[PDB]
Design a protein around this ligand. Structure first.
Ligand SMILES: CCCCCCCCCCCCCCCCCC(=O)OC[C@H](COP(=O)([O-])OCC(O)COP(=O)([O-])OC[C@@H](COC(=O)CCCCCCCCCCCCCCCCC)OC(=O)CCCCCCCCCCCCCCCCC)OC(=O)CCCCCCCCCCCCCCCCC
Ligand SMILES: CCCCCCCCCCCCCCCCCC(=O)OC[C@H](COP(=O)([O-])OCC(O)COP(=O)([O-])OC[C@@H](COC(=O)CCCCCCCCCCCCCCCCC)OC(=O)CCCCCCCCCCCCCCCCC)OC(=O)CCCCCCCCCCCCCCCCC
Ligand SMILES: CCCCCCCCCCCCCCCCCC(=O)OC[C@H](COP(=O)([O-])OCC(O)COP(=O)([O-])OC[C@@H](COC(=O)CCCCCCCCCCCCCCCCC)OC(=O)CCCCCCCCCCCCCCCCC)OC(=O)CCCCCCCCCCCCCCCCC
Ligand SMILES: CCCCCCCCCCCCCCCCCC(=O)OC[C@H](COP(=O)(O)OCCN)OC(=O)CCCCCCCCCCCCCCCCC
Ligand SMILES: CCCCCCCCCCCCCCCCCC(=O)OC[C@H](COP(=O)(O)OCCN)OC(=O)CCCCCCCCCCCCCCCCC
Ligand SMILES: CCCCCCCCCCCCCCCCCC(=O)OC[C@H](COP(=O)(O)OCCN)OC(=O)CCCCCCCCCCCCCCCCC
Ligand SMILES: CCCCCCCCCCCCCCCCCC(=O)OC[C@H](COP(=O)(O)OCCN)OC(=O)CCCCCCCCCCCCCCCCC
Ligand SMILES: CCCCCCCCCCCCCCCCCC(=O)OC[C@H](COP(=O)(O)OCCN)OC(=O)CCCCCCCCCCCCCCCCC
Ligand SMILES: CCCCCCCCCCCCCCCCCC(=O)OC[C@H](COP(=O)(O)OCCN)OC(=O)CCCCCCCCCCCCCCCCC
Lengths: 98, 80, 169, 63, 347, 120, 140, 52, 48
C-alpha cells in the first residue's frame, strides 16, 4: 500500500513502545500516549483525504477533542499524584502491591 | 420580576446584557419573517451541476432550456 | 526529492517519535512531540487537509501541548545511556527500513508497502467551488447532530470531572 | 399399580424421550450445516444495509 | 461529592455503556468508551486518599492504552474496508489489535495486572461498578466482532485468564483482590465459549454480575474489606454469614446452585464442537477459585473467629444501610438452577 | 446462534408471532417456582433487617411474590417463543434440504451384525 | 513458532534422531526464551549480567529438557520398533522430568516432573494419534 | 448486546457516516463509490458467511 | 516497453470488472517527467 502509512504505523508503534516501557515519569507516559494519538490523527486524516470520503472529515476533530479531554483528565491525575508525593515518579505509585 | 431585574442591572450589568443578547439570539429566529429566505437562498445556490433528465415524453414542469418559463424561478431573490 | 516530500516528512515524523519516546526528560519529551506534531501536520497539509492541519496547530500544539508544558513546569525541577542508545537503535531500524524500501520498492514488516512516492494514489479530479474536507467538516452541524450531542456532553462532563477530582474533598 | 399401567406408561416415556433424542441429534446436524454453509436463518451475521446508498447524480459522473 | 453531580456522573457512565451497546459506527464505540472512562474516574476518587489516586491513575493508563489500540484497530479497518460498520473486521491484524484492546478493557490476563490493584485502591461501590458494569460494553463489542476473532488468540487469553485468576486469589486475604481475581477467571470463562455460542457468554455474564453484585452488596452491608473483618460477621449479623456462605458456594460452581449453570452450559456447548481437553482443563482449573471461596466460607460462616468487646455496642444498633436488592440478588444467585432453560431469552 | 432471525425486527421482547403460541398457564411449575423465589426473597428481606421473618410485612412479601410471578410470566413467554423459533427453523431447514438429511434405511436386527463380546 | 512444532511433527518416530532432537531442543529453547522474557519482565534482576544469566539458565534448562526429551523418545522408538506408541513419549517425558530435576538440583521435583511430564507427553502422543483438538474449530 | 435502538425507534444516529456511498454533502462522490455500492448491493441480506 | 517480460498482458485491467474505472494519478502521469508530476500532484496544494 502507501509508503507513508508504513511510517505512521511505525510511529504509532514507536510511541507505543515508549508508552509500554516507562522510565521514571508519568508525564513522559502521557507524552507517549498523546504521540500515539497524534499518529492516529495523522493516519486517519491521510486515509479520509485519500478516499475523498467526505463525512469522515469531521472524525479526526472528534478524535482530537475526545483524546485531548482524556489528556486533561490524565494531567489532573498527574497533578493529584504530584500533590501527594512531590514528584510524578511511577515508583511512588506502588502502595497497592499489598 | 421588576425589582430583581433593576437590582441585577445595577449589580451585574455584564451578565444582564449577556443573558439578554443570548435570549434574543434564541427566540428571535422563531419570530423573524426573514428566516425562511435564508433557507430559500441556501437551497438555491448551485454548487453542483443540474444534471438533466431523459425526456420520456410527459414532464410538463421540467423545461427544455434555461430561458423557458417553467422551472424554479428566482424573481424573489432579485426583487426581495 | 521534491516528489517524495510527504515521505521525507514522515521519516522526520518517525525520527521525532524516536526522539521523545526514548524519554530524556518530560521537558525535552514535550519539545520532541511539538516538533513531531509540526512535521506530521505538514504531512496532513500536503494532502489537502488544511483545516485539519490548522486544527493540529491551533488545538493540539496550541492548547494541549501548552498545557502539558505548563504542567511539566509545575512538576519537574530544572537544572544519558538508555535514552541515547534507544534513540540510535530506532534511528538504525528506521534507516534500514528506508534503505530496504528504496532498494527493493516492496517491503513487508506487517503489511506490504510500495517503494514509489505516494503521489501516485491521488485523484485526478476537481471538487468545484469548495474544499470537500471543509464541507465534510461543515456537515458536523447539519448531519452530525448525535455526534455533537455526545461530544458536547462529554466536554461538559469533563469540566465537571476535573472540578471534582482536583478539589481534593 | 397394574403391570399394564407401568408397561404402557414406560412405552409413552420411551416414545417421548426417543423423539427428544432424535430431535437433539437433528439439532446438532442442523447447527453444523448452518455454521458451515451459512444459508439458513441462523448465524446470519449483519452485512451493510443497502438502503443507505445514495443513488442521486453526484458531482462527477464517473461513479 | 454533590449528589446531583453523583447522579449526573452515574448517568454518564450508563450513557457511555449505552452508546457502546446501541451504535453502529466505530467512532461512536470509541466515544462511548471515552465517555465511560471519563465519567467513572471520579467514582474511583470519591474518598480522596493516595490509594484512590494511584488506582485511578493505573486505570486511566490501562484504559487509555486500550482506547488508543482500539482506535488503531478501527483505523486499520478503515484502511482495508473503507467503512465504519460495527460488524466483522476485514483484517486479522485489526482483529488482533481489537481483541487485545478489549482484553485490556476487561482486564483479562495477561493484561490483568491492573484489576487487583485498582480494585483494592477504590471503595466497594466503585469496585462493584468496575467489576460488573464495565464488563458490559467490551463484551458487547466482542459479541459483534466474533466472525473475525482469532480462535487461538481468544482461547489463549481465556485459559490464561482462568489459570491466573485461579492462582491469584489463593494467596489473597483482601476481599477486593479476591473479587478481582475472580473477575479475571470469570472473564476467561466468558470469552472461552464466545466463538462457540455467545448466548452462553451472555448467560455467564448475567449470572456473574448477579453473584458479584450480591458479594459486593454483602461487603458494603457489613463494611468488611478484609477476610478477617468478614470473619466477625457471626457475632454481629448471623444471617449475613449464611448469605455469604450460599453465595460463595454458588460462585464456586457447586450444584444445585445457580453458579453451576454458566460453566455447565459452557462445557455443554464446547463439547458440541469436539473440544474435550479445553473445557476439562477449564473445569479442573476452576477448583482453585472454589478453593479460596471455601477458605472464605471457613473463615466466615462455618467457624466462629474470636471477636472483640466493642461488638456488644454494635449489637444494640441495626443496619441503616440501604441494602438495595440484596434479598433479590441473593435468591437469584443461589436458586436459579431449576430455571436453567431460561437462557433462551438471551438468544 | 439465531442472531439473523431477531435482527429484522429488533428489540421485540415478544413479537406478534409469539401470540400464535399457547401462553403458560398460571399453574405452571416454573411460574410456581418463581413465586417460591419471591417468597424466599421476602423471607430473606425480613431476616436481614432483623424483622420477624414470617410475620413482618405481609404486603411486602405479597409484593415480592407478585413481582417475581409478574416478571417470570413474560420470561416464560419469551422462553417458549425462542424454543418454538428454534424448532421452526430446524424443521424448515430439514424440509428445505433433503439431500443433507437422507431417510436412513432402518435395518432390522435379523440383518444387523453385532460382535458378541462375552463376559467370562 | 508454529512451524517449529510443524517441523517437529512432520518426521516419523524412530527414523531421524538428530533432527528430531534439534527440533525439540529449539522448541524448548523458544519456550525458555519466552519464560525468560516474562521473568525479567515481571521481576527486575539485580543487573544486566544477572538478567542475561537468568535468561541463559532458563533457556538452557528448557532446551536440555527438550533435547533429552526428543533423544529419549526417538531412541526408545528405535529400540522398541513401535512408532504409534505413547510409552516412548512416557519414557521421554520422564527423561525430561529428570532433566528438569537435575537443573533445579533436587530429586523430588525430578520424580514429580518425571511422572507428570511423562503423562503429559503420552497425552500429547494420543492427541497426535486420534486427532484431539485442544483449540477446536467451532462447528455447530 | 447490540441493542438496535436506532432501528426500533426509527431514528438515525450514526448510519450516515458509516459507508462512503451514503448521502454526502453537496452530492460529493467518493473515489470508490461504485465499487462499494456494488459490494454492498451484492452482500446485502445474504449474511456474512455467504457474503465472504 | 513490455515486450521482453514473459506472460505480460498489455493493457490488462487490475480490476475484474469491465466498468470504466476513474484513472489514478500514477495511471496518467506515471511515465512522464517529474515536473509534470509535481505540477499535477502538488500544484494546487502548494499554490500560494
Ligand atoms: C422488568 C424488571 C423489573 C425489575 C425490578 C425493578 C425495580 C428494582 C430496580 C430499582 C430499585 O432499586 O428499586 C428499589 C426496589 C426495592 O429494592 P430494596 O431496596 O432491596 O427493597 C427492599 C425492601 O422492600 C425495602 O422496604 P421499604 O420499607 O423501603 O419499602 C417496602 C417497599 C414498598 O413498595 C413500594 O414502594 C412499591 C409501590 C410503589 C411502586 C412504584 C410507584 C411509582 O416494598 C418493596 O419494594 C417490596 C419488594 C418489591 C419487589 C422487588 C423485586 C422485584 C423483581 C426483581 C426481578 C425479579 C426477576 C425474577 C426472574 C426469575 C427468573 C430469572 O424496588 C422498589 O422499591 C419498587 C419495586 C417495584 C416492583 C415492580 C415489579 C414489576 C416490574 C415490571
Ligand atoms: C425457605 C428457604 C429460605 C428461607 C430464608 C429465610 C429463613 C429464615 O429467616 O428462617 C428463620 C425464620 C424464623 O426466624 P426468627 O425467629 O423470626 O428470627 C431468626 C432467628 O433470630 C435466628 O437466630 P439468629 O439469626 O439470631 O442466630 C442464629 C444463626 C444461625 O446461623 C449460624 O450460626 C450461621 C450458619 C451455620 C452454619 C451453616 C448452616 C447452613 C445454613 C446455610 C444453608 C446452606 C445450604 C443451602 C443449600 C445448599 C447450597 C449452599 O442465624 C440464623 O438462624 C439466621 C436466620 C435464618 C436461618 C435460615 C436461613 C435459610 C437461608 C439459606 C437456605 C435457603 C437459600 C439457599 C437455597 C439453595 C438451594 C437449596 O423461620 C422461617 O422463616 C421459617 C419458614 C417456614 C415456613 C415456610 C412456609 C412456606 C409456604 C409456601 C406457600 C406460600 C408461598 C407460595 C409461593 C408461590 C405462589 C405462586
Ligand atoms: C509441572 C511439572 C513438575 C515440575 C515443577 C514441580 C514444582 C515446582 C518446583 O520446581 O518447585 C521447586 C522450586 C521451589 O519449590 P520448593 O521449595 O522445592 O517446594 C517443594 C517443597 O520444598 C517440598 O520439597 P520437594 O521438592 O521434595 O517436594 C515437592 C514435590 C515432590 O514430591 C516428592 O518428593 C514426593 C512425591 C513423589 C513425586 C510426585 C509423584 C506424583 C505422581 C502423580 C500422581 C500419581 C499418579 C499415578 C499414575 C499411575 C498410572 C501411571 O513435588 C511437587 O509438589 C510437584 C508436584 C507436581 C507439580 C505440578 C502439579 C500440577 C497438578 C495439576 C493437576 C494434575 O520452585 C521453583 O523454582 C519454581 C519454578 C520451577 C521450574 C518451572 C516448573 C517446571 C515446568 C515444566 C513444564 C511443565 C508443563 C506442565 C506439566 C504438568 C501439567 C500437565
Ligand atoms: C435563554 C437563552 C440562553 C441563556 C444561556 C446563555 C447565556 C450566555 C452568557 C454566558 C454566561 C456564562 C456564565 C453565567 C453564570 C451565571 C451565574 C452567575 O454568575 O451567578 C453569580 C452572580 C453573582 O456573582 P458573585 O457570586 O457575587 O461573584 C462575584 C461577581 N461579582 O449572580 C448574578 O449575577 C445573577 C445572574 C442571574 C440573573 C440574570 C438575569 C438576566 C435577565 C436578562 C433579561 C432577560 C433575558 C432572557 C433570558 C433569561 C435567562 C435567565
Ligand atoms: C428482566 C428482563 C426485563 C426485560 C425488559 C424488556 C427489554 C427488551 O425489550 O429487551 C429486548 C431483548 C431482545 O432484543 P433482541 O434485539 O432480540 O436482542 C438480541 C441481542 N442479544 O430482550 C432481552 O434482552 C430479554 C432478556 C433480558 C434478560 C435480563 C435479565 C436476565
Ligand atoms: C538474551 C539477553 C537478554 C537481555 C535483556 C534482559 C536482561 C535484563 O534484565 O536486562 C536488565 C534490564 C534492566 O537494567 P538494570 O541494570 O537491571 O536496571 C536497574 C538500574 N540500574 O532489564 C530490562 O530492561 C527489562 C527488559 C529487557 C528486555 C526483555 C525482552 C528481550 C529479552 C528477552 C528475549 C530474548
Ligand atoms: C495412585 C492412586 C490410585 C490409583 C488410581 C488409578 C491409576 C491408574 C488408572 C488407569 C489404569 C492403568 C492404565 C490403563 C491400563 C489398561 C490397559 C491399557 O490401556 O493399557 C495401555 C497400553 C497397553 O497396551 P494395549 O492395551 O495393547 O494398548 C493399545 C491401545 N490401542 O500401554 C501402553 O500403551 C503403554 C503406556 C502408554 C501411556 C499411558 C498413559 C495413560 C494411562 C495411565 C494413566
Ligand atoms: C527413588 C529414590 O530413591 O528416591 C529418593 C528421592 C530423594 O532422594 P534423597 O535420598 O532425599 O537425596 O525421593 C524422591 O525423589 C521422592 C520420591 C521418588 C519416587 C518414589 C516412588 C514410590 C512412591 C510411593 C508409591 C506408593 C504406591
Ligand atoms: C494435561 C495436558 C494434556 C494435553 C493433551 C494434548 C493432546 C494433543 C493436542 C495437540 C495436538 O498435538 O493435536 C494434534 C495436531 C495434529 O492434528 P492435525 O489437525 O492434523 O494438525 C495439523 C495441522 N494442519 O497437532 C497440532 O495441533 C500441533 C502440535 C501441538 C502440540 C502442543 C504441545 C506442544 C508442547 C508444548 C508447547
Amino acid at each position: 500500500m502507501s509508503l507513508v502509512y508504513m511510517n505512521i504505523m511505525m510511529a504509532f508503534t514507536v510511541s507505543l513502545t515508549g508508552l509500554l516501557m516507562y522510565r521514571s515519569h508519568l508525564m513522559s507516559s502521557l507524552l507517549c500516549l498523546e504521540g500515539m494519538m497524534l499518529s492516529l490523527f495523522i493516519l486517519a486524516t491521510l486515509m479520509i483525504l485519500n478516499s475523498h470520503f467526505t463525512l469522515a472529515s469531521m472524525m479526526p476533530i472528534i478524535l482530537l477533542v475526545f483524546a485531548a479531554c482524556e489528556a486533561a483528565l490524565g494531567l489532573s491525575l498527574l497533578v493529584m499524584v504530584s500533590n501527594t508525593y512531590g514528584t510524578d515518579y511511577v515508583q511512588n505509585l506502588n502502595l497497592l502491591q499489598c | 420580576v421588576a425589582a430583581f431585574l433593576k437590582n441585577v442591572w445595577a449589580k451585574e450589568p455584564v451578565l444582564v446584557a449577556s443573558f439578554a443578547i443570548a435570549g434574543l439570539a434564541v427566540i428571535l429566529p422563531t419570530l423573524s419573517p426573514y428566516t425562511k429566505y435564508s433557507l430559500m437562498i441556501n437551497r438555491a445556490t448551485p454548487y453542483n451541476y443540474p444534471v438533466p433528465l431523459r425526456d420520456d415524453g410527459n414532464m410538463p414542469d421540467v423545461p427544455s432550456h434555461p430561458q423557458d418559463p417553467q422551472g424554479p424561478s428566482l424573481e424573489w431573490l432579485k426583487r426581495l | 526529492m521534491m516528489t517524495y516530500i510527504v515521505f521525507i516528512l514522515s521519516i522526520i515524523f518517525v525520527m521525532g517519535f524516536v526522539g521523545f519516546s526514548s524519554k530524556p526528560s518530560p521537558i525535552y519529551g514535550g519539545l520532541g512531540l511539538i516538533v513531531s506534531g509540526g512535521v506530521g501536520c505538514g504531512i496532513v497539509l500536503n494532502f489537502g487537509g488544511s483545516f485539519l492541519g490548522l486544527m493540529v496547530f491551533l488545538i493540539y500544539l496550541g492548547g494541549m501541548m501548552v498545557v502539558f508544558g505548563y504542567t511539566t513546569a509545575m512538576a519537574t525541577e530544572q537544572y544519558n545511556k538508555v535514552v541515547l542508545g534507544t534513540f540510535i537503535t530506532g534511528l538504525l531500524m528506521e534507516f534500514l527500513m528506508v534503505y530496504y524500501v528504496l532498494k527493493d520498492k516492496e517491503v513487508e514488516i506487517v503489511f506490504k508497502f510500495n517503494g514509489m512516492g505516494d503521489w501516485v494514489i491521488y485523484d485526478t479530479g476537481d471538487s468545484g467551488f469548495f474544499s470537500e474536507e471543509a464541507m465534510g467538516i461543515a456537515a458536523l452541524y447539519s448531519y452530525g447532530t448525535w455526534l455533537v450531542i455526545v461530544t458536547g456532553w462529554s466536554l461538559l462532563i469533563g469540566v465537571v470531572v476535573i472540578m471534582e477530582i482536583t478539589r481534593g474533598n | 399399580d397394574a403391570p399394564e399401567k407401568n408397561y404402557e406408561r414406560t412405552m409413552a416415556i420411551l416414545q417421548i424421550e426417543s423423539e427428544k433424542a432424535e430431535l437433539r441429534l437433528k439439532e446438532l446436524e442442523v447447527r453444523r450445516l448452518m455454521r458451515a454453509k451459512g444459508d439458513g436463518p441462523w448465524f446470519q451475521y449483519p452485512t451493510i444495509d443497502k438502503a443507505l446508498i445514495d443513488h442521486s447524480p453526484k458531482a462527477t459522473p464517473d461513479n | 461529592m454533590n449528589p446531583i453531580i453523583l447522579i449526573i456522573i452515574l448517568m454518564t457512565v450508563m450513557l457511555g455503556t449505552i452508546i457502546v451497546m446501541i451504535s453502529t459506527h466505530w467512532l461512536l464505540i470509541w466515544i462511548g468508551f471515552e465517555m465511560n472512562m471519563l465519567a467513572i474516574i471520579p467514582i474511583m476518587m470519591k474518598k480522596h486518599n493516595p490509594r484512590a489516586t494511584e488506582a485511578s491513575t493505573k486505570y486511566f493508563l490501562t484504559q487509555s492504552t486500550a482506547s488508543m489500540l482500539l482506535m488503531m484497530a478501527i483505523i486499520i479497518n478503515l484502511m482495508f474496508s473503507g467503512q465504519w460498520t460495527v460488524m466483522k473486521l476485514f483484517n486479522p491484524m485489526a482483529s488482533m489489535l481489537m481483541t487485545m484492546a478489549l482484553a485490556m478493557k476487561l482486564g483479562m490476563a495477561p493484561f490483568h495486572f491492573w484489576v487487583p490493584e485498582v480494585t483494592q485502591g477504590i471503595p466497594l461501590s466503585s469496585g462493584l461498578i468496575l467489576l460488573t458494569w464495565q464488563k458490559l460494553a467490551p463484551m458487547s463489542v466482542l459479541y459483534q466482532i466474533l466472525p473475525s476473532i482469532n480462535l487461538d488468540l481468544i482461547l489463549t487469553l481465556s485459559i490464561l485468564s482462568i489459570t491466573i485468576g485461579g492462582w491469584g486469589g489463593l494467596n489473597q486475604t483482601q476481599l477486593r483482590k479476591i473479587m478481582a481475581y475472580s473477575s479475571i477467571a470469570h472473564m476467561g470463562w466468558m470469552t472461552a465459549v464466545l466463538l462457540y455460542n455467545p448466548t452462553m457468554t451472555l448467560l455467564n455474564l448475567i449470572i456473574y454480575i448477579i453473584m458479584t453484585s450480591t458479594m459486593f452488596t454483602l461487603f458494603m452491608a457489613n463494611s468488611t474489606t478484609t477476610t478477617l473483618s468478614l470473619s466477625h460477621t457471626w457475632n454481629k449479623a448471623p444471617i449475613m454469614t449464611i448469605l455469604v456462605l450460599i453465595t460463595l458456594l454458588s460462585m464456586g460452581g457447586l450444584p444445585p446452585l445457580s453458579g453451576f449453570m454458566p460453566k455447565w452450559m459452557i462445557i455443554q456447548e464446547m463439547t458440541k464442537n469436539d473440544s474435550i481437553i479445553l473445557p476439562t482443563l477449564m473445569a479442573i482449573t476452576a477448583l482453585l477459585n472454589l478453593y479460596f471461596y471455601m477458605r472464605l466460607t471457613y473463615s466466615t460462616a462455618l467457624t466462629m473467629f474470636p471477636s472483640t468487646n466493642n461488638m456488644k455496642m454494635k449489637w444494640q444498633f441495626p443496619t441503616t444501610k440501604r441494602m438495595t436488592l440484596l434479598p433479590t440478588m441473593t435468591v437469584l444467585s443461589t436458586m436459579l438452577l431449576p430455571l436453567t432453560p431460561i437462557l433462551s431469552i438471551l438468544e | 446462534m439465531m442472531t439473523g432471525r431477531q435482527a429484522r425486527a429488533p428489540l421485540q421482547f415478544l413479537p406478534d408471532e409469539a401470540r400464535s403460541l399457547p401462553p403458560p398457564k398460571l399453574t405452571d411449575p416454573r411460574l410456581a417456582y418463581i413465586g417460591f423465589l419471591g417468597y424466599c426473597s421476602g423471607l430473606i428481606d425480613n431476616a436481614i433487617r432483623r424483622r420477624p421473618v414470617l410475620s413482618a410485612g405481609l404486603h411486602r412479601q405479597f409484593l415480592y411474590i407478585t413481582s417475581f410471578v409478574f416478571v417470570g410470566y413474560y420470561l416464560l413467554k419469551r422462553q417458549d417463543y425462542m424454543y418454538a423459533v428454534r424448532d421452526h427453523d430446524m424443521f424448515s431447514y430439514i424440509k428445505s434440504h433433503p439431500e443433507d438429511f437422507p431417510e436412513k434405511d432402518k435395518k432390522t436386527y435379523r440383518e444387523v451384525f453385532e460382535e458378541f463380546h462375552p463376559v467370562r | 513458532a508454529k512451524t517449529l512444532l510443524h517441523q517437529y511433527w512432520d518426521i516419523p518416530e524412530g527414523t531421524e534422531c538428530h533432527r528430531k532432537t534439534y527440533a525439540a531442543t529449539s522448541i524448548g529453547g523458544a519456550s525458555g526464551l519466552v519464560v525468560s522474557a516474562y521473568s525479567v519482565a515481571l521481576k527486575t534482576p539485580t543487573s544486566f549480567l544477572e538478567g542475561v544469566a537468568r535468561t541463559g539458565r532458563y533457556t538452557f534448562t528448557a532446551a536440555a529438557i527438550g533435547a533429552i526429551f526428543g533423544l529419549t523418545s526417538c531412541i526408545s522408538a528405535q529400540v522398541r520398533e513401535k512408532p504409534d506408541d505413547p510409552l516412548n513419549y512416557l519414557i521421554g517425558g520422564c527423561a525430561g522430568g529428570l532433566t528438569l530435576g537435575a537443573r533445579t538440583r533436587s530429586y523430588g521435583i525430578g520424580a514429580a516432573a518425571c511422572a507428570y511430564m511423562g503423562l503429559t507427553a503420552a497425552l500429547v502422543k494420543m492427541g497426535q494419534l486420534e486427532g484431539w483438538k485442544v483449540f477446536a474449530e467451532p462447528k455447530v | 448486546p447490540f441493542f438496535d435502538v436506532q432501528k426500533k425507534l426509527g431514528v438515525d444516529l450514526d448510519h450516515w457516516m458509516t459507508i462512503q456511498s451514503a448521502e454526502q454533502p453537496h452530492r460529493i462522490p467518493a473515489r470508490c463509490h461504485a465499487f462499494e455500492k456494488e459490494w454492498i448491493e451484492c452482500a446485502h441480506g445474504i449474511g456474512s458467511i455467504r457474503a465472504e | 516497453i513490455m515486450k521482453d517480460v514473459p506472460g505480460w498482458k498489455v493493457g490488462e485491467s487490475v480490476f475484474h470488472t469491465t466498468r470504466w474505472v476513474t484513472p489514478m494519478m500514477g495511471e496518467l502521469y506515471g511515465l512522464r517527467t517529474g515536473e509534470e508530476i509535481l505540477s499535477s500532484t502538488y500544484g494546487f496544494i502548494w499554490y500560494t
